[PDB]
Write a protein that binds this ligand. Sequence first.
Ligand SMILES: [Mg+2]
Ligand SMILES: [Mg+2]
Ligand SMILES: [Mg+2]
Ligand SMILES: [Mg+2]
Ligand SMILES: [Mg+2]
Ligand SMILES: [Mg+2]
Ligand SMILES: [Mg+2]
Ligand SMILES: [Mg+2]
Ligand SMILES: [Mg+2]
Ligand SMILES: [Mg+2]
Ligand SMILES: [Mg+2]
Ligand SMILES: [Mg+2]
Ligand SMILES: [Mg+2]
Ligand SMILES: [Mg+2]
Ligand SMILES: [Mg+2]
Ligand SMILES: [Mg+2]
Ligand SMILES: [Zn+2]
Lengths: 66, 174, 141, 130, 139, 185, 37
Amino acid sequence: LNARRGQILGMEPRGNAQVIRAFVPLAEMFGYATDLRSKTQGRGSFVMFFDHYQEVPKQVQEKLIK
Amino acid sequence: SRIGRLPIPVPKGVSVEVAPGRVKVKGPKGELEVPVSPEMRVVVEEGVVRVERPSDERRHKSLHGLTRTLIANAVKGVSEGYSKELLIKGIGYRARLVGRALELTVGFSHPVVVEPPEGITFEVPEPTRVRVSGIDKQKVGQVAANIRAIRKPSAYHEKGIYYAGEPVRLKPGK
Amino acid sequence: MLMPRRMKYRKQQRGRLKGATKGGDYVAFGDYGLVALEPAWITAQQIEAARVAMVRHFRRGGKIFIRIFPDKPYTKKPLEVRMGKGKGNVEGYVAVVKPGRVMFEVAGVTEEQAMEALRIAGHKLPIKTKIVRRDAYDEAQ
Amino acid sequence: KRNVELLATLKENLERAQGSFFLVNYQGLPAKETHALRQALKQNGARLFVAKNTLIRLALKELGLPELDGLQGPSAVVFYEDPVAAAKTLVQFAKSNPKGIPQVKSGLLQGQILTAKDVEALAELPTMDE
Amino acid sequence: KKVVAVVKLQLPAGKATPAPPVGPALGQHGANIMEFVKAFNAATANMGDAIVPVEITIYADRSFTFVTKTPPASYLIRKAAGLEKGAHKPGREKVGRITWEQVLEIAKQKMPDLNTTDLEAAARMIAGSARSMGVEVVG
Amino acid sequence: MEYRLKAYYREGEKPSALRRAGKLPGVMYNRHLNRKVYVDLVEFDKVFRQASIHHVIVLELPDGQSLPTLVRQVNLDKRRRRPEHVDFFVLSDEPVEMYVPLRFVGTPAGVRAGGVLQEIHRDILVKVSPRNIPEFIEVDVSGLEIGDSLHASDLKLPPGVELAVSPEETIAAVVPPEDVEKLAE
Amino acid sequence: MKVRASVKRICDKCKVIRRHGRVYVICENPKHKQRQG
RNA sequence: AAGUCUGGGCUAAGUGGUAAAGGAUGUGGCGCCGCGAAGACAGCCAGGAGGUUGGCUUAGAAGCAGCCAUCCUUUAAAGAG
Ligand SMILES: [Mg+2]
Ligand SMILES: [Mg+2]
Ligand SMILES: [Mg+2]
Ligand SMILES: [Mg+2]
Ligand SMILES: [Mg+2]
Ligand SMILES: [Mg+2]
Ligand SMILES: [Mg+2]
Ligand SMILES: [Mg+2]
Ligand SMILES: [Mg+2]
Ligand SMILES: [Mg+2]
Ligand SMILES: [Mg+2]
Ligand SMILES: [Mg+2]
Ligand SMILES: [Mg+2]
Ligand SMILES: [Mg+2]
Ligand SMILES: [Mg+2]
Ligand SMILES: [Mg+2]
Ligand SMILES: [Zn+2]
């Protein structure tokens, strides 16, 4: 999660099982299901939703201007 | 602070005979010759053996400790015996004696068979422990090691041949 | 970075680097210093590189004193041209530096901190150096 | 060479405030267990003198130089000194014999003792409260 | 049929949900885990807050036993100094103050937890835990 | 606090010879005499690194004289950072001009704010009898923030012990203090 | 193995050795293994 | 062609008999401070503890992200690590 340019929000239990909430940029959620399944032995899962927009990094922005 | 000067207790009843060039150690379990630099003096005393060096010149101090231990290891060799234990680990993996020979089964497309050199004797007490035993310290070492080398501990799994007492340090792997 | 603001003359003859320093040999301001162990024309960018390195070590911060300043213009002809047809173009500025010169000083910093700082600064310089520390011998001068 | 000087004296002072010093081998008790078996002999032995555990070496130069009967019970090993006289103990060593000889495998085990000014003994000092 | 355990926890006041560390190391009691919401928040419903320590033991017929300590040094001092939080940066901006003799009573609250069994010793721990949060001792 | 030093007379001995010999060629003078001396380097060093130009040093010549001196100069060889020569001033009962250390008592409000005490004088010039040479002179630097200085004009001053430099001579300053944040620009 | 002109202790468990004419740094952590060259 | 010449020392690389920044328990020799039979250095046997998650700061930073501060306690000792 952090390594995907994300920013984590918190952690609660469920079916025990655990849940981890985060804001990651969508640009970094492509094909997530598969790393997630690798990183969790095919035992975890996820849901994901648009929350908001914000300033892409000054080092990303100016690559895009092509 | 010093190995060479540390006297060597000799057990009743192993015997230590000095020559120039060598010292011989005999006991219940065999006999051993230990090559010794002709610059050191090996000294026999009551139920003890000492080693003396001719100066504090670097080579002599270095020879000093080495010589004491070399003789100390022979003393212990013929009296107590030396030995090392290898633990086999991993699901398919096991060993068994076959004559005096050790047949190692460790996940190659074939068993591996190890003939014990002379002075070395193999024990497979359970089927996942092997015991290399012998009078010669370094040789015991060398063979234990040879065996272990047939398939070292993995980086990723508690799997392979291990010195008993040797720690399993892993690293995560996906 | 460093260079005179104005000059009576733009290019100068190359000169020669015989001699222990002329002066500059004793620590004058800080607690720690770095002395040239050998002659060299040290470059504005080399000084700057060292200065910068030092500040980066302290982060914030101590005091850096700079005791050499490059007033010698360094000349060079354009690539691939022949000899003749007048002296080369000023392309930079340098400080003549002879052995025993205290080049940089530091203060307001621990022993550990000034030692390291001057070590790194050394590595940006094209000569041998030693680190020294203030003394009665310095003060006496 | 050293605070071994300021340390001897501080043992002499605390010996020169007595006539009856005992000696225990405060070996492997944890920290929980320790501020217990200590605060124990501070609520059964006056002032704040349970053990003033210090160097066997300096604790023989001190007994030696006050002469204090040459405390040579056994200054070998781990050694702590249950100052029974800078307190007000007696059979208050029972306060030791009951905490150690139950709450461990050999709790606060004893070694030497000098009651009044006279050499106590082995188990005859360790039964000096039974 | 799980083992005789000597558990140590630190849960705050309020949140009495049987989730870690009230889950893994507390299965071994077969614990009336939700008996804690009521046997805790009855000594801490007059208070409201304060993290109150605890040790939770189990035996051989699967039942749990727990006993608690006294609210943090950092806690007690906060609501005698007119503060919710500390002082952000300890040193330059005190955001509260306490007389020599108000630390003493705060100390007195903590007398049965510490190392010393004193006051003049006890009170400086308190006063020392006042620099650690940058609130000056009125003296 | 009043140090001593064997010192010997010399005539024609080449300084190179002496220097090689572990010794340190020197000279002693005031207005009454001028003698050529040598002193063993390592003995000299051990003293002067505490004495400096601040404390009296007593030269024990072979004739059994014991002259009280201040060091007046030490010539360093520029290339190898070492003493080549010393000038011992034979103090007499007159007042003397000399250098008196400054002890900077206090932590500036300027420091403790990120900044740095540029100690511009680590001693100060003074007219004074040898008989009351003040081994110290304290200066409170506590009221200093980044921006401030202190001149000689301040400076308590014992008896007596006058100044010997303009009072308008700045002696200490507190200056701002190297910042990575500046760099990039 | 790292092979360099400058070989140096990297952590506190790093140990500088000389075998058979060459300076090596051996260490518990295999990333610190160095051999000068 | 003429000394396998004489006395002292260093070198172990065939350095000698091809080079720099820089790097290194190579080897020898100086010097300076340090700890040490009131027992040091090395191994090994205990302990290594409270107030306390120190305050702030993220959602969590409970000695060890990072900004401050770095006290107090029992103590033989034990860092706000
Ligand atoms: Mg053997
Ligand atoms: Mg092999
Ligand atoms: Mg020219
Ligand atoms: Mg150039
Ligand atoms: Mg040109
Ligand atoms: Mg350089
Ligand atoms: Mg000048
Ligand atoms: Mg120097
Ligand atoms: Mg010198
Ligand atoms: Mg490098
Ligand atoms: Mg290693
Ligand atoms: Mg010859
Ligand atoms: Mg080579
Ligand atoms: Mg060659
Ligand atoms: Mg060659
Ligand atoms: Mg060398
Ligand atoms: Zn390492």
